[model samples]
Target: APTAPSIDMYGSNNLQFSKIELAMETTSGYNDMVKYHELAKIKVKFNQWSGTSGDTYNVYFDGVKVATGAITGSQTTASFEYGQGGLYQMEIEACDATGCSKSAPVEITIADTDGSHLKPLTMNVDPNNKSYNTDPSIVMGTYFVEWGIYGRDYTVDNMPVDNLTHILYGFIPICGPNESVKSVGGNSFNALQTACRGVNDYEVVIHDPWAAYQKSFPQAGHEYSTPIKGNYAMLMALKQRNPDLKIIPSIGGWTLSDPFYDFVDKKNRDTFVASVKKFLKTWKFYDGVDIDWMFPGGGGAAADKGDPVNDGPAYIALMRELRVMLDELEAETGRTYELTSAIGVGYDKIEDVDYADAVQYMDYIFAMTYDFYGGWNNVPGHQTALYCGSFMRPGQCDGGGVDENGEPYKGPAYTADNGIQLLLAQGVPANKLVLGTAMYGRGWEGVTPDTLTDPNDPMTGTATGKLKGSTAQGVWEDGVIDYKGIKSFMLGANNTGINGFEYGYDAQAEAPWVWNRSTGELITFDDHRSVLAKGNYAKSLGLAGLFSWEIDADNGDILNAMHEGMAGTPPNRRSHHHHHH
Candidate 1:
């Protein structure tokens, strides 16, 4: 029978020759047809026969063998040029000393080339209707620490520029009680200019619109009369270098948020918008403004005057007034502008603003989802967990309470997913919500390894094991470590394990952590895997995009993972399945 079908001792392919199969690696965006003169790369797959060499694979187009010598393994990739429009059949097959097999014929449609099929026309600039279409793209945003430019060699040249679409230059203090923007970091303005180099197709926003003072508005003169001082002028010069960049100013951070109560009040709303519009016109470089009040209702600075009943309604009115003013300026200057916000994540914080009405005026919203638990609570938990864990399941952590360590903790175990869902529930469009991610990890010292057996465990500081590395200047708090530091110094070897610490992954939270057995140093932070999970989750929910709290913290890995994850191409999901001979 055909020379008895030559068999090996194990009869590898004697009784059953391996089945040859094919699949497309580009599953989601697989457009089987191409216009003439266009390029199409088709990845065809097959089983490697038991006794075959690397030259047994063949790919056919329209019944004619066009590509050959595909190394026999699991796949044979081919690039083809279509010269005409027609129904084309594609097939991959292999033949070895043992046997031969073929994949089912796959038909592809090639559309005819014509003037209409030439280069597609670009979209017009329309933020409300056209810009936010169903393109499935997400925003990649990061904060540029202004102070980093002054020290630690943190400059724009070192920023993850290629991985970002928006960069928020953090924290310009409101000085002179006039809501005047001034750079606090000496020569930090030059650093900002250096950091903004080569930033094409991106946005640069100034963070911190502190509360307005009675002295902010001059009774004797127009608001535009205020001299454009500090980094505000530097931004204009930088924009001249990169015409594609937009400089948007943000207002109301934790320390400066108290003034927002007066800024959003009914009596002050008109003057506030008028003064803001005049200020922007004077600079001419400012594209828009961002509201970052810690919370409109109750959860901001201790002295912040917020009305639980009126804060929500007043915030909506403020945004509406802002939108009206921005549109008026756009018509006058023939330039487009943006209106955005940094919103709170907690349900209590969420209840402080009328997002349903506010979102209509905003280009995007940054949900501050990180820092759910930190040194404030002395808990060993994931700072940027993607989802809630068992401790706060079924709508727990909604109210502030005490944890295992007898320390006060904030409401429910918050997560990135929880924030996005809550916003959607508040009538915000899925595409308008941008998820916030942290570029650093928070750490706690003085805890035994056993204390961290649970990701939710709280610990008290010990004599031997105490917090390491105080927070970087101009950031959230102490006990913080950047991703770069974590990689180069914190991780023990090969960037996988922790030095003097036990590395572990929390399945419930879908996060990673490390704890020291002897030193009792427990560290919680976002790795590439965890960030990618957040990114994938953002894409799954059709979010607007991702915004990291600060870019200087990342070495390189975190942003790369976030970019890939936002594109629906996570690292774990990219593994290839194989066929056996």
Candidate 2:
């Protein structure tokens, strides 16, 4: 690693840091050396350690430099101001009869400002705290962090690490460039990705080597699995991007529930545990482990019946065993890898698992908060929602749900508060929980017609007189929309000849929702705003930060903002830095 250059701008002893520093008792003034752009000004002040009695001073602008008699009382005061624009570098040098002198140089940039009094300006670019400052910039007001099972596929052409500050590389389920059989002996997909192609600045994760071994050896099911390699190639690539990136191997996902449960049994636990220690020795890229266990209840497997009551106990035991192995692995290998997990959104669902013991070994918990209300259902609601907004609150949950007036209840339940509170109530430390954000939006047909009336004329109804697309002769395609597409359409929509009613919000969401009243069409989606909202929520909860689904989708400023919101930043100016001597 190369170190940044350092400077002793101020001499050794009695060194002080201010916006600026100067030399010993030099008394002289010259024209402002700094220039400004259309609304720029300059200001300067000075103080001496000891007062000089015989000397007097008067300030001089660049234009007044040669005026010999310009010198006034050398001890008292002197200053001036100017207004201009463009590049300006000012040098202020002072001199006295003793031959002692001091010089200070400063440069600055100024934007077009309304005319105001001119004074020596303090230079700053992209001030540290801007009114609307947010990190990871937001698009359509949402942000995201990408992580998943398909590490190689996800990184193809797309640098998830660059797009996202945090990258969750789930069990590298493939070797080399594909998710097929591994090429290394006893190696699995997780080891192969790291051994070969490494990702950029991401918190890389590899699934348990034991689970992979189990899948390969039988004890559970699969007869044969491919080999995976573990080595320096992976570490080099990651360090090239971000030397600070942390790599960890994760365990368990929807598919691993069976093996995980089986490993908990005393009979098979040792083989599983031993396999991991050996595997960890081979792949040195990982710095920790993450456990991603899907629901243990009836929702997952058909042949295997999961114990809902003692599910917590089972999970705790598995974690305890893993912790022992990790400790042993560290004592032997000299690397103390962290443990973490990706958990369900709501409290009730996670409560079935033994989170307490798991939390003990785990470094943090990634709350899978996205997909709250997905396209799995016909009716639509945001995949993430902070709370029930007035316009969309009624009839949003349960079958046959009705108000006191006997109105039909809405199906599908999702709200930002629901997921956040669920995790908080479960005793998950705020920092351990990472709110989820999606890069896509789910769509629906049959939007309520009356809701589409023109805002200008409430009486005038709106209608989608025509429709055309694939599958059927004339029907809208069931496809997801990204933020870029939304903004492009909004800005380009022609309002004169066919002033169509467009429903959208500049607002970001933890979950995005849009509706076209004329055609009775609705879509609940995830945009930058939704992501940012989650980020904000994460910050408020004092959680570690946020996580996103895929960095490949709408992955620029919008995503940045979402992450920034989670980082607890308001939006505004970006950066302001200067070096002085």
Candidate 3:
């Protein structure tokens, strides 16, 4: 006799019903949403089931037999369609040959559509994130780092593409048609360097060939899961599922950015610019290009740093040329292509480029408003503070955080507003600038007690730790903990915190943090409040949109804040980006 299946949890309010995970989704998870259209999908989780061959599940919904779904995977889903608006108490039962375990019901509301719902700008598009009232103005974007597949063991298919408008494929190197460039295994340091130097022909060479279009992934529901495989294949497949979500490739990062120096030069720039068109045309999945030049002139790695003065104008030149190429392609393909730049923030970095003039050639300027204070900082400072909480009770927080000696820090106050305002000052329109948010935390250990913990500012406790580099294990690097790791603390931990770590938030700076007295460490990052504050701030400024550094770092919390904060972005524009002109 076959054993009975254990129905664990079920979601009444869910996405198009893919294989959702446990009740508490950790990384790149979806938010418990509400309201549906003509067709609504529900997902149920089963604890144990015979997932062997020859398996079928009689999934019962609302106490009625909705359909017989294949107990294909752990995260089981079934769907139904109803024209009218009403409430549904969704329950699930996994039935095998012998018995089935009934799971509790979850109520979902399918909103009444008078056929008056807003339509997509273009037809034949999958309405994934484009819900009834989702903002076309607000360009809520996230970076899906290609390396995350290896580091965090996150696959392209596992990423949360629900509430996003753009997903950037990071670290696509600037390469030439060279043999060495073609042989590189992945997005490694050597790979970026080899590809960067191999610019003998100037091309947008895919460094992660295996991860880009080679290695095969599970072809769950992605029908167009490309010819070969890899992330390129996955993204293309996802494109069909999420038609509104724009896919862009960010060429050049910290390590591989060296080539941009030469690529922007006289002869090199021309060849490189033309090749990019070919790259985009070949990878038709991409909607735009994001030039992730770490720094224009000289701020990146010392390996191939270019001239600060010369590269400044050249950087703008590259954007201009790229824009020119995109326009030509736009006319040729009958599809619009966007040209964006990932720029460094604050006076030190922002001043490097002529953003005022640069804005003319670009559609969006993704101001990298993060990494303000990280392991590189001697003190445990706010990684991405919206405001300079200089006088926010503790004198230590004036310069960010205090040192072990109880002395205030003294550095460029790289707060979000600090850098963002300068761009506005430079005549860059508010709607053209995007505020960058970090979904990770930066920490410092060996901290000393606060000189004065204000009664008004209890959460911003005393943290004067003048230390460099991280002494504890973080998600990716030592000095950092991905927001996914931070979410764990927010979940099961005690009211105060887990272990000796206590969660705290600085009202003045509009940021959150967790510190441990035992370890003499403090980790500062954006919590829900901070994210909402940042989002609201961007909306208040009427900024172009809000984009977090990454989606992998989040567990739907950050995305929630973004949706709430920048809900109505691009308010004065069309729903689609392809209507750029």
Q: Which ten residues in a row have the lowest lDDT in candidate 1?
A: 26-35
True-vs-predicted CA distance for residue 495, candidate 3, Å = 6.7
Residue by residue across 376-489, what tens digits does model 3's lDDT show? 655445778887763343433335666667766663467888788878878899989898888888776655455225433323344444323322233455667877576575
Candidate number achieving the greatest lDDT relative to the actual structure: 3
The C-alpha stretches of model 3 lying farther than 4 A from their native spots are: 1-132, 176-187, 192-202, 220-226, 303-306, 391-412, 450-474, 490-495, 567-581
Model 1 stretches with alpha carbons more than 4 Å out: 1-137, 172-245, 390-412, 450-466, 470-477, 569-581
**What does candidate 1's lDDT look like per residue over 320-344, in tens digits?**
9889999999998788888888888
Write the candidate numbers in order of decreasing TM-score: 3, 1, 2
Superposition-based RMSD of candidate 1 using all C-alpha atoms, in angstroms: 23.8
* TM-score of structure candidate 1: 0.60
Q: lDDT (0-100) at residue 273 of candidate 2?
A: 53
lDDT of 2 at 210: 30
Candidate 2 backbone overlaps, count? 72
Residues 115-183, candidate 2, lDDT per residue (tens digit)? Answer: 011122222221221233334322111121113112212221233344343445444321112322233
Give the C-alpha miss distance for residue 93 in model 3, angstroms: 51
